[PDB]
């Protein structure tokens, strides 16, 4: 069974393509997201986090992706204006086609450095 | 085939247990490592990066791990003194029992925040 990975990649494709209503089809109402800045609960808060993220992306590529019947693990590169390469990894739990847990890891430092450098000159 | 994942987890176990000579058995002489601060080439430079890292770890747990014949993907939590939880994800390429490429993602921000806060009071 490929179910969880198929859901993870369908979500990822829609999210990176800024087709958010489609991406949110794959998100459980009670999703728990653990992200570098902290914990997010519920599809509404999740959307408020994911949507601005997708809109700073200007390219991406999946580097590695695996899963089984209920979990998936993937790593992808992203391109942004301030940071040329900002790779991320995600661990997803999926039940009946919906992501119920999502842990995402990426390095915030390059963004903070770009943002402080711009703002102080 | 589980070869790449078996190598990845054997490396991980030894590295987190501070058994570095054993961990380095699983590292190719010409390893290419892509880490948050940049690219590292060769087992000597890799050791100079991994060893100090292991020695700030005071606990860890594998959250997810998958692989096939030549690549593996894993995500693990770590505990440190300045940062209670610093999870990382690794994408490994493995040939004939040796890691020849390693991309690792973790968020440097909490460390930098702890380090600046300590040093300025």
Question: Could you give a short description of this structure?
Answer:
The PDB classes it as unknown function. Helix content of chain A is 37%, strand content 41%.
Can you offer a commentary on this structure?
Chains A, B: It comes from Kribbella flavida (strain DSM 17836 / JCM 10339 / NBRC 14399). Chains A, B: This is SnoaL-like domain-containing protein. Chains A, B: It holds the Pfam family SnoaL_2. The structure is a homodimer of 121-residue chains. In chain A, strand 4 (71-80) and strand 5 (88-95) form a beta hairpin. The longest helix of chain A is centred in the N-terminal third of the chain and has 14 residues, at 3-16. Helix content of chain A is 37%, strand content 41%. With 121 residues, chain A is of the alpha+beta class. Chain A has helices at residues 3-16, 20-24, 43-56, 109-120, and strands at residues 27-35, 38-41, 57-67, 71-80, 88-95, 98-105. Chain A has four helices and six strands. The N and C termini of chain A lie far apart (52 Å). Chain A has a single domain, classed as Nuclear Transport Factor 2, Chain: A (Roll), CATH 3.10.450. Chain A binds chain B through residues 36, 63-68, 71, 73-75, 87-89, 91, 103, 105-109, 112, and chain B through 36, 63-68, 71, 73-75, 87-89, 91, 103, 105-109, 112.
Largest sheet of chain A: 6 strands, mixed
Order of helices and strands of chain A: HHEEHEEEEH
Tell me the name of the CATH class of chain A: Alpha Beta
**Percent of residues of chain A in beta strands?**
35-45%
Please count the beta strands of chain A (DSSP E, at least 2 residues each): 6
Q: What pair of chains forms the biggest interface?
A: A-B, 22 and 22 residues
PDB class: unknown function
Keywords: Midwest Center for Structural Genomics, mcsg
Assembly: dimeric
Entry title: Crystal structure of known function protein from Kribbella flavida DSM 17836
């Amino acid at each position: 069974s490929t179910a969880a990975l198929d859901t993870a990649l369908a979500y990822h494709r829609a999210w990176t393509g800024r087709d958010f209503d489609t991406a949110m089809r794959h998100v459980a109402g009670g999703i728990v997201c653990h992200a570098p800045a902290g914990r997010i609960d519920g599809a509404d808060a999740f959307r408020a986090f994911m949507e601005p993220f997708s809109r700073i992306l200007v390219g991406s590529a999946v580097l590695s992706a695996f899963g089984d019947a209920t979990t998936a693990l993937l790593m992808y590169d992203t391109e942004t204006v301030p940071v040329p390469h900002a790779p991320a990894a995600e661990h997803l739990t999926v039940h009946d086609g919906r992501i119920t847990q999502l842990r995402i890891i990426f390095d915030r430092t390059p963004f903070e450095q770009a943002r402080t450098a711009r703002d102080e000159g």
